[PDB]
Each structure stands twice: as C-alpha cells, then as structure tokens.
Design a protein around this ligand. Structure first.
Ligand SMILES: CCCc1c(O)ccc2c(-c3cnc(-c4cnc(C(=O)O)c(O)c4)s3)[nH]nc12
Ligand SMILES: [Cl-]
Ligand SMILES: [Mg+2]
Ligand SMILES: [Mg+2]
Ligand SMILES: [Mg+2]
Ligand SMILES: [Mg+2]
Length: 193
C-alpha cells in the first residue's frame, strides 16, 4: 500500500521539475536519459556480470539499450509486494520522463516483459518466452511533453560519450547503432583491451 503511493508521488515529483533531476529539459537532458540507462549497465559490468552494451537509435527516436548482465531480478519484494524489476523501473527518472518504456528481462531461462507510460506500468510483468541468455533490454521514447525543444538524438553526441565510456571502462564492448534511416544504418563499436 504505502510503498506504491510513494511511487506515484515520486513520478509526479520528477515530471513536475524534471530539470532538477536531469539537469535540463534541452537537448542535453534528452541525451542524459541515455546516460542514466547506460550507467546502470556499466555498473553490472563493473560488478563482474556483463561485458557487452548495445545502444540503438530506433525509428522515431526510440532508444534501445541492451546488456548481457544478470537480468534485472523479477522476484517479489516483501516491501512493495511487486516484482523487483517493476520497483526499480517505477522509481527510474528515465521511465517517469518517457512517454513509453518497455523492459525485457532474460533470467531464469525465461523472458519477462513489462511496459510503462510516464512511469506507470501498463500490465503486470509477464513471461513471454524462453531464453538461454541473461541480460536486460530497455526501450524508451522520450516524452515530448517534457523535452519541449527536441526529442531527436545526435549520433555524434552519443558516439563521443560511448567511446569515452568504453575507454574508461576497459573490457566492455559498447556498440552504437543508428537505425532511424533503414536505407543507411551506421554503427560504431568500441572495445578497449
Ligand atoms: C539495459 C538495462 C540497463 C539496466 C537498468 O536500467 C537498471 C538495472 C539494470 C541491471 C541489473 C540490476 N540488478 C541486477 C541484478 C541481477 N541479479 C542479481 C542476483 O543476485 O542474481 C542481483 O542482485 C541484481 S541486474 N542490469 N542492467 C540494468
Ligand atoms: Cl529473479
Ligand atoms: Mg542513476
Ligand atoms: Mg548503480
Ligand atoms: Mg544508476
Ligand atoms: Mg571485453
């Protein structure tokens, strides 16, 4: 009960003063969404559990982030009575500030899925398939109501920072791919020693 009320209030808080959370609602804050997700994958590699991160700019400026870590856990929490992944994603700034967000978890030889709008789950987490891999996929579309200047990402901005992050975090393979124009797909992949 109380825990879920505090999630809703957290969502209202983020969406009311987004600049207080991501710095700005300009092009800078739009790209900050990517960094918030990529940092969580980087943590999972530094913990010893992932070594590959993929960032795709999809049609209509969805972003897809994929890592080969353990998979965000799906076990039910004592505190929230909800799957752990739902708790982690409902308190995410990126989810609060996205019109839509999807997660796919590969864990327990199972694929789990949940979708959200403005941070609100659209349906309970569900098993959708099977897998012999572990990791996590997050796809989101920035909310144009928040990001009033632009919701268009800059490949070069993303490329520069991805290359910095792979240089800093040696051993992680970080790939950027732009699929916005299906006729000309660009990829850069970074992997330092
Ligand atoms: C593309 C997604 C980016 C991305 C996020 O935004 C957010 C969380 C993410 C994580 C994980 C978080 N917690 C994890 C874990 C897994 N297993 C155990 C265990 O004990 O087995 C455990 O304690 C913890 S994985 N990975 N990636 C994430
Ligand atoms: Cl689990
Ligand atoms: Mg963070
Ligand atoms: Mg962390
Ligand atoms: Mg983080
Ligand atoms: Mg490596």
């Amino acid at each position: 009960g109380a825990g879920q009320i505090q999630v809703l209030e957290g969502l209202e808080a983020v969406r009311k003063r987004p600049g207080m959370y991501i710095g700005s609602t300009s092009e800078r804050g739009l790209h900050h969404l990517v960094w918030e997700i990529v940092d969580n994958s980087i943590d999972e590699a530094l913990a010893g559990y992932a070594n590959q991160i993929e960032v795709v700019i999809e049609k209509d400026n969805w972003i897809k982030v994929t890592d080969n870590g353990r998979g965000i856990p799906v076990d039910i929490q004592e505190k929230m009575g909800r799957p752990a992944v739902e708790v982690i994603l409902t308190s995410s700034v990126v989810n609060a500030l996205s019109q839509d967000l999807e997660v796919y978890v590969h864990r327990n030889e199972t694929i789990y899925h949940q979708a959200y709008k403005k941070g609100v789950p659209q349906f309970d987490l569900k098993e959708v398939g099977t897998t012999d891999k572990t990791g996590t996929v997050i796809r989101f579309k920035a909310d144009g109501e928040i990001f009033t200047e632009t919701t268009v990402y800059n490949y070069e901005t993303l490329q520069q920072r991805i290359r910095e992050l792979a240089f800093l975090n040696k051993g992680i393979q970080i790939t950027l791919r732009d699929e916005r124009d299906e006729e000309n797909v660009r990829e850069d992949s970074y992997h330092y020693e």
